Fold this protein.
Amino acid sequence: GSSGSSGIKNFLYAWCGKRKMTPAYEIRAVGNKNRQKFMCEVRVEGFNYAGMGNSTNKKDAQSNAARDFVNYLVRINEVKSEEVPAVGIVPPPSGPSSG
């Protein structure tokens, strides 16, 4: 649908809510004024790490930040990767794109 998706943002929020916590997001604007980009960080109380993301928009930047903090929860074995949803974002091809 035209609103995109929110599965990894909802997964971190639901994981926090099953543990009596709430995730805290933090955002910065970067790049060209007409062709703007955004960076995102996300943190949770009692954890020293911050998951990091970026994109052309705040929603995809939050989804990358959420995926990297949920990945950290697998690096410390507080979450199994088998439960974690796909981020919904893919990189551009490494070849020419000028025409």
